[PDB]
Amino acid sequence: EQDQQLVERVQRGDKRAFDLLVLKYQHKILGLIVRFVHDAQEAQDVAQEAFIKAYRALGNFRGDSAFYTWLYRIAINTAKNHLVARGRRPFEGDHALKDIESPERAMLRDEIEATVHQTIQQLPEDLRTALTLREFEGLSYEDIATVMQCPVGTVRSRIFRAREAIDKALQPLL
């Protein structure tokens, strides 16, 4: 459960935690939906419908599956029902996005990707190591603190500082 802490608050009735989960996953859900509908505005509408349907179904979210898996399945159901009701209009790789998305958005993504990787390349090693152990090895702060032989609070601050450096480079682009 990659979203354990926000999911815990959602299950205590917290709308703000759900909003953060929408922010985290909206691009993945939009990218899924656009493979079904092949229209930019229609994809946004149906992706929005999927999130509201998921919200309204939270009573049935028991925490047995990962939140994203539960959300993904609802988005698939939403897209399917949308298409079956709509009928014929009057999926692999990046074909759908490349055809539908704004060309300016692809140019911005190219810039953002180069900037993220350049910022990480230039980080001090303690920051890049803490971030990589967290993001790609999945280690908890405690286990990172053990591997790097530092206090757990230093792991927390190092990961924060690494994300802030990336974010400061991305802020003008966004």
């Binding site: 993504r109 702060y141 990961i159 974010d167």
Partner: protein, 79 residues
């Protein structure tokens, strides 16, 4: 009170499910009322997706409309 910098650090802990319970409540309350904090969370998650070569659609947003629609719903049920 928590500074903006301290709340951004809390967001970083939340991304990793490492936040303490009280700061988790406070950062969520602050996100409800502060657009720049929500945008920081949004950009932190964008960078994570970029790092992992996952789908991104920079500057595209439906979350604002979702949130406004959900403002008119009852809070989700407690487990």
């Amino acid at each position: 009170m928590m500074s903006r910098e301290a709340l951004q650090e809390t967001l970083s802990a939340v991304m990793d499910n490492e936040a303490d319970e009280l700061e988790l409540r406070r950062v969520l309350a602050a996100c409800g009322e502060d657009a720049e904090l929500r945008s920081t969370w949004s950009r932190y998650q964008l960078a994570r997706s970029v790092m992992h070569r996952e789908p991104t659609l920079p500057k595209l947003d439906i979350a604002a409309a979702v949130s406004a629609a959900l403002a008119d719903e009852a809070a989700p049920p407690k487990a």
